[PDB]
Point group: D2
Chain length 121, copies 4
């Protein structure tokens, strides 16, 4: 059991639902606490499907481009992190958010931050 498939929450009011395939694929959706369709976006990613057995976390990453049928922010976020299992399972990530810019504004195109996701809201 990879423990990754299911619904995950951050503390800022966001939810994502992911399926972890046997081949290393991550597929799902990223949405708001609200759950309205205008706030739901496609996500795709990859994870290590044969992690080490010594207590290390499971490395993974995924991308959301912030376009759906209703809105387009001309940007994309990537999260890079690891899953840590157990009774208090969590995904610890750092992320990069890049917006489309002109070349003169490219120096300010990319934000960086961190997010932790848990199975309980």
């Amino acid at each position: 059991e990879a423990g990754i498939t299911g619904t995950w929450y951050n503390q800022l009011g966001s939810t994502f639902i992911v399926t972890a395939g046997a081949d290393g694929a991550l597929t799902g959706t990223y949405e708001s606490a609200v759950g309205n369709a205008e706030s739901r976006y496609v996500l795709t990613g990859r994870y290590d499907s044969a992690p080490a057995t010594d207590g290390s976390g499971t490395a993974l990453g995924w991308t959301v481009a912030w376009k759906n049928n209703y809105r387009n922010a001309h940007s994309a976020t990537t999260w890079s992190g690891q899953y840590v299992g157990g009774a208090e399972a969590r995904i610890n990530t750092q992320w990069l958010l890049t917006s489309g810019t002109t070349e003169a504004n490219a120096w300010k195109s990319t934000l960086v931050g961190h997010d932790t996701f848990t199975k309980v809201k």
Copy 2:
């Protein structure tokens, strides 16, 4: 356009297809690190970019497991495609390795890659 074969400054090879739905699919071969042969990638891009001269936002993930090796890590690239006489994809990236909790502070490398359609070998 984004579909094609790209090379970064280290000689790594990025073969990608951009789908009409915003999907990126393809393979990645790294010239550096604990890696051999090709790895699956998946990602997303803005399929309706702004018309004001801004670049096209995108991102993708590779988990560093294939049939030959497993590095227990994953890299995400976040960036934009800039069309023109010499098209380029400018990225920043995060590489996370699976670690124990005591080593999680040193789990994540950061860097930047530039891709072009001409090999700078």
Copy 3:
């Protein structure tokens, strides 16, 4: 309110004085509190922040050399001080190690630290 003793989530200790000009000076060490683990730090902060509830931007550097050890590396922290009932400094950091040219792609780690005036 920046001047004083601060601790991060891992037990390291940050002793800093903020000057009227914008200067940060002090020492950075581990929880063990031995002399071998203490390093000089220098940095800068916004000495006239906005009055709309925003934090105070700041940053500082430690090179990991002292009279006992040299790791051939340096960390910079970039963040903001948030005043109030529970004072906090929220940061992200970059640690760069000296490398050969062929290894420069793996020279730099990134992470985040939260400091408070009370030990974790």
Copy 4:
């Protein structure tokens, strides 16, 4: 090899003195012909680097306030100096702006710059 004037490709200049105690001190000029574009910088470097071809680790901070302007932000650069006939300082940087708590998630930009001893 660090002391002197360095240029990036975007039109900035900085002049730095590397002290024997590991200090970096100097001025950062964001625009070529503007005196209201000069800011204090302070940092640290490895004063005893390896002699095997590795670079020299360093970092520094500018807070974007002077006697004329205040952007309520600060940048830290973390990187290494590489010597030789075409000397360079290769960095990654973090820029944090003071925000309210509700906007702290978008407080920090990340990027990279390369400095050389000759103008681009």
